[PDB]
Amino acid sequence: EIDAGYSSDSSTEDVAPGLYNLYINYDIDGKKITRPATPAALDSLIASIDKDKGWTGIVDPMTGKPVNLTTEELGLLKRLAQSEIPDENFDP
Amino acid sequence: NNVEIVTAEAMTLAQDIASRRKSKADLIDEGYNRWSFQSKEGLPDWFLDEETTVNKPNKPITKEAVLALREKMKALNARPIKKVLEAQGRKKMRTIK
Amino acid sequence: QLFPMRFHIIRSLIYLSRAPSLFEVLDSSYVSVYQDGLIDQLLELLSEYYVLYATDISFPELVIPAIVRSKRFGLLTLVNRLEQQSKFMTEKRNQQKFAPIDSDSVEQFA
Amino acid sequence: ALGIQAQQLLEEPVENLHLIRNIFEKFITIKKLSLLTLLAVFRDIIPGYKIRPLKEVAQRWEYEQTLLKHYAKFLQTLETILKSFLSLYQVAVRCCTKLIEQASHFNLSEKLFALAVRQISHKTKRPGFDGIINSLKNIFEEDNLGKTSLKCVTILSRMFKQRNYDVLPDVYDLFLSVNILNDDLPYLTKKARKNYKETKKITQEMKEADAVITAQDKEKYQSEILKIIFITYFKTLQLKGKLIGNALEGVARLSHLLNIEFLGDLLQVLRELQATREALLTVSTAFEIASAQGVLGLFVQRLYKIIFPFSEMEMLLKCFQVFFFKSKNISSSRLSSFSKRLAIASMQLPEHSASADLALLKKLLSRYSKLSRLLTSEEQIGDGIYNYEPFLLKNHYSPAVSQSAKELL
């Protein structure tokens, strides 16, 4: 047979975050996930007044906190947006 | 080394990586195209300047990235108390006249 | 170490007169055998100050900030005595319905 | 010899580069005199405009390069003198302050500003700090473009980050000194006249474009300066150090220039928090923010409840005056309830402060007279009679207390 599995790179996967209401409602088996507490107003003002490097402004449905790309993700975006080979060590 | 996302094209791309809508592995594979293999390493300025002006792939653009860029471009003093009250007032009194 | 000197000065001042300093001493980490003796001395000084100002019509009003501070912070007996004094002062003030011009009634109550 | 060389340099600075080299070679009293002469010569010979890095033009460029090299050597010597650290250090500090005041637009000004910031970043009050602060304030006031002010703000931000937002209170006061946030004829040939007319037209067009460019540049610089200041203030507030008062004062001063959404969000940060003094400052800042023209119950409740722990006087009087100055927001039988606690707490503190507090309600346009006696129900936590003080206030250590009570009655 074929085990009817899922590959690690399948185009369909859970969690589809969107442009930053809070979707902290439930989970599998119909249990309510605890809503993470809203961040401190001082910290929220700091983030809003100073955008972090690679500030996407996208929030995952599970938590209200924004999702920001890491250094390697900023590196891949730089290569992709500047139209070069997205692999640093691959002889073209 | 850093990078400043100011082009809406990059923001549509940056949104896709973060929002996980488009898989990262698929994005890497989609980056091996006719334009990525047209390398720009060491070319003279008189050549590159026209190449960017002309031979620039036009990637698709999403309204969400447009809003996010406007949010980034929104300065701290873009709309303070005066620029929201008297600037609204001058338009209002103009319409009245 | 210098708390007994402050208590002696407070007692001398109370005798000459006949709260914030006493509250700070009571709320001090030392007060809040020597510590027990200092606490007892502070309670006695507070009682003497309360008794001296008990004649005033505004005795419950003046002792209200001290009562709130004491409640937030022998101590139970002092708080109960202060609450009883405030209740008696409030009852006397309620009974003394005379206008401010007729200050003789307030003085007679005092 | 130094005076003769300085006079020769003043007369002919173009061909007196060796005189500067000789002065540097000749460079405690002699060293101080040489440094003063070098600073005076540099100030007299420095061009008033920025020198663009690379016989009419080539020789001038060579002379500018030689002058820049001499200034760099002088700056390097000054940095070593400052790092060595008393009279010589004070003289060097004075020379640095003069250079900042005069050659702010010249090259290496960032290095001079960095050296001044490093000297002022010390926890102890080093000599020349007042002069450096005065020079920075003058530069901030005079900088209409704000490019130098933005560079100084970035330098101060780096120093604050290095010091973990733990510096002298006067350092934060430099932010409030930003003026941007606080805002017959000779004969001419026939061909010459055509050139003059064209030059006049070009000058008018350039001036109009420069004014528009200046407006855009000032707005951009102001936004960047505000971003740096707000971030530094927010970081200081997060640290909750001893500079909270300076941060609150800076926040109150620069709150008007921020966005409407930021102003509304600032209330939550203020309400989210010497604890009594910090609460009083937060209440005062909230009142100041609400006092903005063209426009808080938790802050009002905190202010009312903070009176008992207090029992600073000028700040309390200013807050009460601002509350009274509010249009129809007070004197609706609520002020008397608020003033009842103030009268009760007035049994202590200086008589002048108590008299001023009494005069605040005495001069009030409200006709209520029961605030000094039994009054209406005491809501807002209460802790008092719901339903006297002057009688006890008469018996006080200060004889004038009885006279004030009699006058009030």
Side-chain angles (χ1 to χ4, degrees), chain A residues 1-19 21-61 63-92, chain B, chain C residues 4 19-20 37 54 60 65-66 74 99-100 110, chain D residues 1 3 6 13 40 47-48 53 58 72 92 103 114 116 127-128 131 146 169 186 192 209 211 215 241 245 247 250 252 264 275 279 286 290 292 294 297 309 343 345 350 354 356 359 382 384 390 399-400 405:
Chain A
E1 286 83 358
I2 50 176
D3 316 333
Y6 266 49
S7 281
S8 70
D9 72 309
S10 188
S11 47
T12 172
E13 78 273 28
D14 7 63
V15 185
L19 193 43
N21 186 70
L22 65 162
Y23 184 11
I24 323 168
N25 206 342
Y26 272 96
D27 207 349
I28 203 62
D29 300 335
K31 62 102 175 179
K32 270 204 176 297
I33 46 174
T34 81
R35 300 200 306 276
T38 72
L42 189 140
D43 293 333
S44 86
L45 198 51
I46 283 180
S48 173
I49 215 70
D50 202 47
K51 304 301 175 29
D52 196 2
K53 194 189 293 182
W55 173 74
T56 311
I58 286 294
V59 286
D60 46 347
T63 61
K65 56 182 67 60
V67 178
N68 275 350
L69 297 179
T70 78
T71 67
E72 48 269 13
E73 272 149 10
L74 271 293
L76 257 290
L77 160 83
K78 182 253 287 182
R79 304 193 73 90
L80 261 58
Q82 279 201 303
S83 281
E84 73 194 5
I85 322 296
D87 209 312
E88 291 189 3
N89 47 359
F90 157 69
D91 215 353
Chain B
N1 189 356
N2 60 3
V3 66
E4 297 91 322
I5 325 179
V6 308
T7 78
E9 294 182 76
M11 272 306 268
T12 68
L13 192 49
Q15 284 182 353
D16 271 29
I17 318 143
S19 84
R20 304 291 184 189
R21 153 191 320 170
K22 179 56 152 61
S23 169
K24 186 186 289 186
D26 291 353
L27 283 156
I28 291 172
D29 279 334
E30 192 179 78
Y32 293 73
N33 55 91
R34 81 162 81 235
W35 280 300
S36 80
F37 274 66
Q38 292 177 10
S39 98
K40 307 175 191 63
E41 310 298 324
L43 278 301
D45 285 1
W46 46 260
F47 178 67
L48 278 190
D49 284 5
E50 191 195 63
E51 280 270 299
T52 75
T53 297
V54 181
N55 198 6
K56 186 64 179 62
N58 294 337
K59 273 154 186 95
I61 272 283
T62 81
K63 190 62 56 64
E64 326 313 298
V66 181
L67 309 172
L69 244 177
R70 295 201 192 106
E71 208 281 333
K72 288 205 152 183
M73 284 327 90
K74 179 180 284 292
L76 277 79
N77 64 24
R79 203 181 72 186
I81 53 161
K82 53 183 299 152
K83 286 183 182 171
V84 79
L85 164 156
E86 59 91 14
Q88 185 267 331
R90 49 94 184 163
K91 191 259 282 186
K92 188 57 69 177
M93 158 35 47
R94 198 265 304 283
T95 53
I96 289 159
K97 288 183 175 180

